[PDB]
């Protein structure tokens, strides 16, 4: 391969960024998969986009990036697929989801379900294999849970579903429904957009929280009825304090484990509420911003005194568990690194500060600026 981007330039100090030699996978350093073909992530230049992961066209050029991850499989059913006319999921049949991103049309965990059906040769569903299924993050049609195995306590398997699109409803109005289950917190930590249709949380009855949500906030339409009905009365709920986390924003929660928060009383850490941040006390490294609680660069050096990060990204931070290099605190100092006008530089290694340049070719490890470097 000829060089992608540029090659170690010595002002930026990060193999940047243009041009030199071109690109290809067609076994020909030119440019660039003309009309025909796309381009791999790894600086190739292929055709048909590397199944995992997808295509994309920033700046009219057809790069092809990483799915991150699950990739996106849209599935269908129940009745039709797949699937085809069939009460709830069962039991069979649930297997037809492994790796469903999001799954057009509705979905019923009805209890003719785990019960098993004979009448149609169908073993009870295993609560286990109901975690199929956290691969799901969207629903075109609607959720409809009237069965749910009662030594569960939330809608766990449904913990990554982000969205209940419109798009069809249980009866001609009603997009999410959770009629009379045994659980105790909805457990819908990733659903914050019910596109359209109505929520009805009927007769749950050990069911705390789930009426602290400001529902309208998730509703992308006009007359969005949320009918919270016959449930665990909020004193029953106050008497345990299945109250939202102390640590939780005024906004809400869905369980009580802080992760179950809606937005945070203090700051957040990457999916779950937190006390305060670690920018000052080590542990993942850490440093605040926008109230999220981002870690530091791997190559930073902590401190009782100082803080360890002025921000995200490698360079800007307080010190260095591997030398330094202009701004850029390098993990391992470059050595044999080509090119730029054909040069495999070739830089190291003065103590206290950064790396200094070598003298021609030297694939061997060369010291000072003077001469005595390469025998």
């Amino acid at each position: 391969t000829c060089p992608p981007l540029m090659l170690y330039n010595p002002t930026t100090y990060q193999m940047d960024v243009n041009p030199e030699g071109k690109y290809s996978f067609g076994a020909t350093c030119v440019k660039k998969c003309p009309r025909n073909y796309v381009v791999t992530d790894h600086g190739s230049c292929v055709r048909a986009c590397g199944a995992d992961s997808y295509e994309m066209e920033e700046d009219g050029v057809r790069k092809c990036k990483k799915c991150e991850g699950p990739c996106r499989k849209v599935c269908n059913g129940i009745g039709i697929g797949e699937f085809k006319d069939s009460l709830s999921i069962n039991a069979t049949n649930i297997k037809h989801f492994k790796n469903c991103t999001s799954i057009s049309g509705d979905l019923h965990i009805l209890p003719v379900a785990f019960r098993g059906d004979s009448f149609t040769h169908t073993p009870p569903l295993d609560p286990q294999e109901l975690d199929i299924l956290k691969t799901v993050k969207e629903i075109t049609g609607f959720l409809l849970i009237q069965a749910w195995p009662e030594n569960r306590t939330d809608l766990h398997a449904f913990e990554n579903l982000e969205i209940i699109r419109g798009r069809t409803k249980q009866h001609g109005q009603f997009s999410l429904a959770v009629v009379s289950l045994n659980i105790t917190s909805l457990g819908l930590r990733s659903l914050k957009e019910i596109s359209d249709g109505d929520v009805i949380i009927s007769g749950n009855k050990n069911l705390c929280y789930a009426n602290t949500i400001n529902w309208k906030k998730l509703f992308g339409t006009s007359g969005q009825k949320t009918k919270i009905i016959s449930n665990r009365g909020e004193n029953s709920c106050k008497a345990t304090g299945q109250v939202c986390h102390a640590l939780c924003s005024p906004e809400g929660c869905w369980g009580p484990e802080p992760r179950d928060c809606v937005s945070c009383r203090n700051v957040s850490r990457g999916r779950e509420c937190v006390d305060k941040c670690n920018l000052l006390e080590g542990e993942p490294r850490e440093f605040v911003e926008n109230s999220e609680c981002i870690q530091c660069h791997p190559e930073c050096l902590p401190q009782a005194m100082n803080i360890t990060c002025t921000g995200r990204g490698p360079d800007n931070c307080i010190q260095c568990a591997h030398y330094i290099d202009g701004p850029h605190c390098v993990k391992t100092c470059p050595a044999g690194v080509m090119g730029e006008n054909n040069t495999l530089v070739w830089k190291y290694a003065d103590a206290g500060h950064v790396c200094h340049l070598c003298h021609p070719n030297c694939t061997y490890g060369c010291t000072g600026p003077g001469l005595e470097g390469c025998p």
């Epitope: 009237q146 009662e150 009379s180 919270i228 016959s230 009365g233 909020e234 004193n235 029953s236």
Partner: T-cell receptor, first 113, second 108 residues
């Protein structure tokens, strides 16, 4: 079309047990569209709600009634049924069986006789 | 439980005149509330559910009204054939409770 005839014992001896049976004319007890329920009304008074049962376990009964009731559902004769055990002096009343609609009105809409 | 307190017990009124009825719920039943009508010998007849809407069809004169903890039954202009005891009936939080009543008698 639908209707909830209450049926069985006129008299019950105290410390003995009440059981009654409701039933279900023009509709298939076994569907999630309905809680089937019971309320009773001590003669000369307000209604008191007892408990109910969905077409899969899930009963919920009235704490008031102190663990005595349970509900259940013979699907043969397409009905569902009370028992209150430990019936007392103050258990004496009128038991209504009735239907709730979840998706409609969330409420009692058809009571039997 | 979560007490409905219908008031005021007893209301004699006389034809085409406005009748005004009410629970105060002990804690907020949001809107989850329905009104009923026990005419002797039979019983109940749901009339309004949620505040607010009349089932189908109760007579348009039947009206209510209310959210939070205080709601109101307004029979608009009373028949004789409005002789019943009328009932509150919440469904927000188990246990379901009804109110006290109001016996509504019409003066001839």
């Amino acid at each position: 079309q639908v209707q909830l005839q209450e049926s069985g014992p006129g008299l019950v001896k105290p410390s003995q047990t009440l059981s009654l049976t409701c039933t279900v004319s023009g509709g298939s007890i076994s569907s999630g569209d309905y809680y089937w329920s019971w309320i009773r009304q001590p003669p000369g008074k307000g209604l008191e709600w007892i408990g109910y049962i969905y077409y899969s376990g899930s009963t919920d009964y009235n704490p008031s009634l102190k663990s005595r009731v349970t509900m259940s559902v013979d699907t043969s004769k397409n009905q569902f049924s009370l028992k209150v055990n430990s019936v007392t002096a103050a258990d004496t009343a009128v038991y209504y069986c009735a239907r709730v609609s979840i998706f409609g009105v969330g409420t009692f809409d058809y009571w039997g006789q | 439980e979560i007490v409905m307190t219908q008031s005021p017990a007893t209301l004699s009124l006389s034809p085409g005149e406005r009748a005004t009825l009410s629970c105060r719920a002990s804690q907020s039943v949001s809107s989850y509330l329905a009104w009923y009508q026990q005419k002797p010998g039979q019983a109940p007849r749901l009339l309004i559910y949620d505040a607010s809407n009349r089932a189908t069809g109760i007579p348009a004169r039947f009206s209510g009204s209310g959210s939070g903890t205080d709601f109101t039954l307004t029979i608009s202009s009373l028949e004789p054939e409005d002789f019943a005891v009328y009932y509150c009936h919440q469904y927000g939080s188990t246990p379901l409770t009804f109110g006290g009543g109001t016996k509504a008698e019409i003066k001839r």
